[PDB]
Amino acid sequence: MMGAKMAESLRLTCLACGQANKVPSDRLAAGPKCGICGAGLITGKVAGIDPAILARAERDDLPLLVDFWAPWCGPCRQMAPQFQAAAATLAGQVRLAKIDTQAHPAVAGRHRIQGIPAFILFHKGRELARAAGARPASELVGFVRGKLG
Amino acid sequence: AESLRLTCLACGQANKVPSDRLAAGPKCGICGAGLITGKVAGIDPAILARAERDDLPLLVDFWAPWCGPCRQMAPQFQAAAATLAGQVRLAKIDTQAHPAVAGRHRIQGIPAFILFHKGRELARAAGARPASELVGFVRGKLG
Numbered sequence: 001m002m003g004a005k006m007a008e009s010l011r012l013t014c015l016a017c018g019q020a021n022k023v024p025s026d027r028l029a030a031g032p033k034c035g036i037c038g039a040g041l042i043t044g045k046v047a048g049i050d051p052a053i054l055a056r057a058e059r060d061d062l063p064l065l066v067d068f069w070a071p072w073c074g075p076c077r078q079m080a081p082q083f084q085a086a087a088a089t090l091a092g093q094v095r096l097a098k099i100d101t102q103a104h105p106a107v108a109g110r111h112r113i114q115g116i117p118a119f120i121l122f123h124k125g126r127e128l129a130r131a132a133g134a135r136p137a138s139e140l141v142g143f144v145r146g147k148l149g
Numbered sequence: 150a151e152s153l154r155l156t157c158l159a160c161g162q163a164n165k166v167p168s169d170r171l172a173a174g175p176k177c178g179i180c181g182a183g184l185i186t187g188k189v190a191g192i193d194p195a196i197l198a199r200a201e202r203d204d205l206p207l208l209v210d211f212w213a214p215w216c217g218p219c220r221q222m223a224p225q226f227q228a229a230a231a232t233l234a235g236q237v238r239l240a241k242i243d244t245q246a247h248p249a250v251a252g253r254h255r256i257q258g259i260p261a262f263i264l265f266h267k268g269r270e271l272a273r274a275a276g277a278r279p280a281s282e283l284v285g286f287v288r289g290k291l292g
């Protein structure tokens with residue numbers, strides 16, 4: 001009879017292979033890696049993900065912010081570097097990902113995507129908020145932090 | 150609120166868990182397996198022997214893959230496990246793979262369910278049923 005391990009952890013989907021991983025709440029800054037494919041789970045970077053990974057990632061214990069974008073759209077192209085800067089800023093608090101709605105045509109209907117770039121904030125399988133239209137990194141960070149508060 | 154002895158259904162190790170934190174995803178301090186998963190663990194006779202004695206009720210599906218009603222019952226037993234998460238832990242044991250366990254539990258027909266708590270048999274049922282019915286039965290035996 002020994003004590004059980006009671007340290008809180010967060011369910012994170014690996015954005016590279018889709019594996020459900022558990023990360024100690026105190027190791028968010030330790031560069032944890034997926035136990036299956038080795039990909040960093042909290043990189044502060046933007047992963048381009050597919051519809052299967054997206055459906056899994058929406059259910060995570062750490063908030064997920066997704067840029068629904070398409071390369072033919074000028075504002076989406078301009079937004080890409082802004083979204084990368086937001087990711088660096090939000091590293092450890094929110095994970096950022098993007099999904100090309102031209103490459104993956106069924107995702108738009110599933111999330112009632114309207115104008116693009118569209119940003120949806122997910123947490124534990126719920127959509128917390130959304131915004132659409134290109135904007136500076138800091139404005140998006142502010143919007144996100146406001147919704148998490 | 151009290152502390153509960155739970156058998157790790159993976160490693161067999163006796164773990165102590167506060168009763169108020171059963172939803173906190175406690176892990177076996179040896180092997181690291183989640184102790185309260187809300188899922189069905191396929192266990193062996195050694196682990197079963199220990200887990201019968203736990204402070205949280207344990208419901209065991211005695212099954213075999215050759216049995217059509219058992220195959221049908223499997224996803225119903227998984228549904229029951231989700232519903233009962235934190236109240237009752239669910240496990241199954243393959244009586245074909247482990248051919249002595251059924252005799253040792255006076256099991257005839259399968260699927261058969263035995264509800265254990267602190268080394269006592271609380272209840273027994275035999276034959277496939279919907280998840281809602283099994284959950285209802287088990288909850289009734291616990292109050």
Ligand SMILES: [Zn+2]
Binds near residue numbers: 017034037038
């Ligand atoms: Zn991975």
Ligand SMILES: [Zn+2]
Binds near residue numbers: 157159178
């Ligand atoms: Zn263990």
Ligand SMILES: [Zn+2]
Binds near residue numbers: 198201254
């Ligand atoms: Zn027994």
